[PDB]
Design a protein around this ligand. Structure first.
Ligand SMILES: CCCCCCCCCCCCCCCCCC(=O)OC[C@H](C)OC(=O)CCCCCCCCCCCCCCCCC
Ligand code: SF4
Ligand code: SF4
Ligand code: SF4
Ligand code: F3S
Lengths: 52, 929
């Protein structure tokens, strides 16, 4: 919102890091956080991602 | 990854001389039986072309009225197990069979100068008439020889408590056709026990809730460990298992039994349970039963008959008969009697037939070290058990689908064990082994079997009897006749001891793995244990109260030290369990089971005592572990407010007053997505969750039938178990004493299937018959369908799940190489899925297609009972009912009209084709609150 944190590239580069990581967690909230606990509580997983 | 421009030149080998009965492409069911505990179960096995493929119950047999057990179902993998013994071993070195007869008959001639003094035998509690009759020839040809019967789980107390209360020994036959009130203390009778299938159906036949039912069994259970009887139990009470022995003494004083002399005051809530039960047994006296499990001491089984005969159950419900087994005075006391004889070097020829006591020893009877103190110790077992590692000889086993033998079920109905196949490896069963000891080696098993039954058949001809005995299996001519009893009183005059304080380890057989004789069976191991959905692990179950006291979690690794012996076991908190007590599972840690049960830890046999072999109060837990895998399939064990979509429960107190009291009245839901008509066969299923006691026999029946692959424990903990049908415990409320309900979950075959609109290549489509067709070949492994499936029934072949306990699935050098022995247990009309292919409960299309095509060939329609799915005709309780919905006189369309009928997740209009029935559980007025 503030031009102080937009023209200043170290902040725009830190906010962009915080969005690329943040918008990855949105795709994790939408997919895994909504799949691992759904209908039928007897089908609740966790998905710790493997090394691959 | 297999690839080729053309599939290889598949060969078509015909017979060399085709039998007059084998039509290629047709099941040709046989009629055999299986010695579970010496008693028969009466099978009816699918013999495709010589080889068996699928084990089913013989509807004419009393021990299994058309439905099988959990162990009994997966014993087609135990046969087609590549770890089965393939040749005899002389002192570990593999040798031939005819070399054993050379050194076994040389030992008989060395045991003939001496009048058969060192020819002890360690068979396990056999009831086979032809094996009894050869035991008789062995004990008169060698008069001083002895035959010690040792089964680690068998009737050690119930047979020693029967003669403790009656004088001579009797064999009780409980009947639940007429039993309105069951009070079974520690009675796991709907268990893998020999009468488990019948006592599950006869108990379920009492709780068949319908449009107008008003009277239902009650089943007060009183058991320390939550068991598959506690699901059907309407008042289960978590008891310490040291109070049971004087919880029956309290019931035997309310019911009037003269000299019980009860002691050790019970509780505020265990006493309220024993007044309400006794006030319920005094009513409906003739139609009731007081069962007693095996864990209890013999004085409790003596009181189990002191109450049954006091309520007039003799002749009506409890029937005492001649003992079916040969000697009931064997077991833990006969194993110690032989071990004290193997010490000092009295034993010279020790044929351990099937007992495997080097593993099954109670750790006080030192059989491991008493062995090798004998010069010649044989063994005839299908697996090279921990005895074969230490015994000199080891004859191959000849698994019951390869052996010409017989059994004798409960009530004495003998069943000729009928070999479907000739033994894959040279068998030499227990009858073909005693022929070596008797001195008639070249005389096969079938020769002695008829040489005994020609004597026992005095009525009419033989081929009109023998083939009728082989056709039905059930001979039902040796029915164990009744016996007048006396019930000599005063057996309870001995005062009960001072109640000992401390945590109690209660020894229990594992539902799935009974006594470790089936530990290499990958099917009944991957199968989740009933209450705790663990698969490949033996655990120390504790109640939530008696683990928050020790500060324990679901993953720690405790060191159970009971009377000097430590075991280093995991821990799994079980809500229904009892306070200050842990349980154990019999038969897991086997050093030489094979490649499947080779290191599944926590051998619980090394904690027993042979004086407290089923429960003891001298345990010190003292956690020494931090984290363990504990692969369980379920996940959340709580009905998270999602009743009306999960198993709906109620009580008969509010079912007689309003039949439709849990059927929610909802309007016709709007559906934009068209509507299709199924004018053909409308294949539907109606599960009755009121009687689903989580026997897990339907879980294996879908594995034996649908070629479902076993998965390793490393990949079940990742939630990748292949199980098209699963039973779901849900533990509603009061985590110290929770009621537990099952909703056996399979593919609902939704008419508006959401898992179909989401397959990009259109693999999973619906049918004109009305069931979701999973096509395993068009499946590119997108795996999206499960994410749209509301029930998450669809299971995905993530890796090459095939022969997984025999080849770790995380490899690919052998993922196209198949075990040749395992290729025979697979169903020849179900696709053996490759990797990257989703699967689901297909209503057994392999049975619908082969029957519809047989119907269209004969220009007729499908009969109501002609298409039984694999999980329908294996469920002992007959919960699952599958059939045509368009046929108006069908047992499903007359079962989907019940007031309890509901479908899972009807808030999203999938139109599920399976329709569960609610769990009405007949609460007592003066016991509930
Ligand atoms: C790039 C993704 C394009 C999708 C093409 C799918 C080919 C997958 C395949 O052919 O694997 C089969 C074989 C068993 O798999 C194999 O034999 C191993 C194949 C290794 C591929 C390594 C190179 C990656 C692609 C460049
Ligand atoms: S439905 Fe499944 S769990 Fe229930 S009794 Fe039948 S086989 Fe056992
Ligand atoms: S219940 Fe699940 S697997 Fe069966 S048709 Fe519906 S979405 Fe597919
Ligand atoms: S119908 Fe057959 S394949 Fe489907 S869940 Fe039941 S047993 Fe398994
Ligand atoms: S969505 Fe499609 S292709 Fe295969 S596994 Fe699932 S079906």
């Amino acid at each position: 919102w503030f031009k102080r944190f937009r023209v200043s590239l170290p902040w725009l580069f830190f906010i962009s890091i915080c969005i690329n990581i943040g918008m990855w967690f949105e795709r994790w909230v939408i997919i895994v956080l909504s799949l691992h606990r759904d209908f039928l509580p007897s089908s609740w997983g966790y998905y710790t991602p493997s090394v691959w | 990854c297999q690839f080729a421009l053309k599939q290889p030149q598949e060969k078509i080998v015909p017979y060399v001389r085709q039998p007059e009965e084998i039509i290629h492409g047709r099941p040709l069911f046989f009629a055999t039986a299986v010695t579970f505990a010496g008693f028969g179960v009466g099978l009816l096995v699918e013999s495709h072309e010589g080889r068996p493929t699928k084990i089913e119950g013989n509807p004419d047999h009393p021990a299994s009225l058309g439905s099988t057990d959990l162990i009994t179902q997966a014993m087609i993998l135990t046969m087609y197990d590549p770890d089965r013994s393939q040749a005899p071993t002389n002192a570990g070195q593999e040798t031939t069979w005819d070399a054993f007869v050379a050194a076994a008959t040389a030992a008989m001639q060395a045991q003939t100068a001496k009048q058969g003094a060192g020819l002890r035998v360690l068979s396990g509690s056999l009831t086979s008439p032809t094996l009894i009759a050869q035991k008789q020839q062995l004990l008169t040809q060698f008069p001083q020889a002895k035959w010690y019967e040792y089964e680690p789980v068998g009737r050690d107390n119930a047979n020693a408590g029967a003669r403790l209360a009656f004088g001579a020994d009797v064999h009780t036959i409980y009947r639940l056709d007429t039993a309105k009130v069951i009070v079974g203390f520690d009675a796991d009778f709907t268990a893998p026990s020999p009468t488990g299938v019948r006592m599950a159906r006869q108990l379920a036949d009492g709780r068949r809730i319908r449009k107008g039912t008003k009277e239902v069994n009650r089943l007060y259970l009183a058991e320390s460990t939550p068991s598959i009887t506690g699901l059907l139990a309407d008042h289960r009470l978590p008891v310490r298992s040291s109070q049971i022995e004087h919880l029956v003494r309290a019931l035997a004083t309310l019911v009037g039994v003269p000299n019980v002399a009860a002691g050790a005051p019970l509780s505020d809530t265990e006493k309220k349970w024993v007044e309400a039960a006794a006030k319920d047994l005094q009513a409906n006296r003739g139609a009731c039963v007081v069962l007693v499990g095996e864990s209890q001491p013999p004085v409790v089984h003596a009181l189990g008959h002191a109450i049954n005969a006091q309520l007039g159950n003799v002749g009506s419900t409890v029937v005492y008969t001649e003992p079916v087994e040969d000697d009931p005075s064997g077991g833990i006391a006969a194993l110690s009697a032989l071990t004290q004889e193997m010490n000092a070097g009295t034993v010279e020829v020790l044929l351990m037939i099937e007992s495997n006591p080097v593993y099954n020893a109670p750790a006080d009877i030192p059989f491991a070290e008493a062995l090798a103190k004998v010069p010649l110790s044989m063994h005839v077992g299908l697996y090279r058990d921990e005895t074969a590692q230490q015994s000199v000889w080891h004859i191959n086993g000849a698994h019951f689908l390869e052996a010409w033998g017989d059994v004798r079920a409960f009530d004495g109905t003998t069943t000729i064990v009928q070999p479907l196949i000739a033994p894959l490896y040279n068998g030499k069963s227990a009858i073909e082994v005693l022929n070596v000891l008797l001195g008639k080696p070249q005389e096969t098993g079938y020769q002695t079997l008829t040489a005994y039954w020609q004597t026992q058949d005095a009525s009419g001809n033989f081929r009109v009897f023998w083939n009728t005995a082989l056709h039905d299996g059930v001979i039902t001519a040796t029915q164990a006749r009744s016996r007048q009893v006396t019930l000599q009183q005063g057996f309870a005059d001995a005062a009960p001891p001072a109640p000992t304080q401390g945590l109690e380890i209660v020894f229990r057989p594992d539902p799935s793995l009974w006594d470790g004789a089936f530990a290499n069976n990958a099917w009944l191991q991957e199968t989740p244990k009933p209450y705790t959905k663990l698969t490949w692990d033996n655990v120390a179950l504790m109640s939530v109260r008696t683990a928050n006291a020790l500060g324990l979690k679901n993953g720690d690794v405790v060191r159970l030290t009971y009377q000097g012996r430590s075991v280093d076991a995991p821990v799994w908190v079980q809500p229904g369990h009892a306070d200050d007590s842990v349980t154990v599972h019999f038969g897991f840690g086997r050093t030489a089971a094979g490649r499947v049960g080779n290191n599944v830890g926590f051998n619980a046999y090394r904690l027993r005592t042979s004086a407290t072999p089923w429960f003891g109060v001298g345990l010190e837990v003292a956690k020494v572990g931090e984290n363990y895998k504990l692969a369980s399939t379920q996940g959340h064990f709580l009905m998270e407010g999602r009743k009306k979509d999960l198993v709906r429960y109620g009580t008969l107190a509010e079912y007689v007053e309003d039949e439709k009291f849990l059927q929610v009245e909802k309007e016709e839901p709007i559906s934009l997505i068209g509507e299709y008509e199924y004018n053909g066969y409308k294949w539907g299923m109606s599960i009755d969750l009121n009687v689903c006691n989580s026997c897990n026999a339907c879980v294996v029946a879908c594995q034996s039938e649908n070629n479902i692959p076993v998965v390793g424990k490393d990949e079940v903990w990742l939630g990748r178990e292949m199980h098209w049908i699963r039973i779901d415990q849900y533990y509603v409320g009061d985590e110290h004493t929770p009621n537990v309900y099952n909703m056996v979950m399979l593919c609902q075959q939704c008419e508006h299937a959401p898992c179909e609109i989401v397959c990009p290549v259109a693999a999973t489509v619906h049918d004109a018959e009305g069931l979701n067709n999973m096509v395993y070949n068009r499946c590119v492994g997108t795996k999206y369908c499960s994410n749209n499936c509301p029930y998450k029934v669809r299971r995905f072949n993530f890796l090459q799940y095939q022969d997984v306990p025999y080849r770790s699935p995380i490899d690919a050098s052998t993922e196209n190489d198949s075990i040749p022995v395992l290729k025979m247990m697979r169903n020849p009309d179900v696709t053996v899925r490759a990797r990257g292919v989703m699967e689901k409960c297909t209503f057994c299309v392999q049975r619908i297609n082969e029957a519809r095509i047989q119907a269209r060939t004969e220009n007729r329609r499908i009969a109501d009972g002609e298409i039984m799915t694999a999980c329908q005709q294996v469920c002992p309780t007959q919960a699952i009912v599958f059939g045509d919905l368009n046929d108006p006189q069908a047992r499903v369309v007359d079962l989907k009209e019940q007031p309890l009928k509901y479908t899972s997740l009807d808030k999203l209009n999938t139109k599920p084709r399976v329709s569960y029935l609610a769990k009405i559980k007949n609460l007592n007025p003066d016991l509930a609150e």
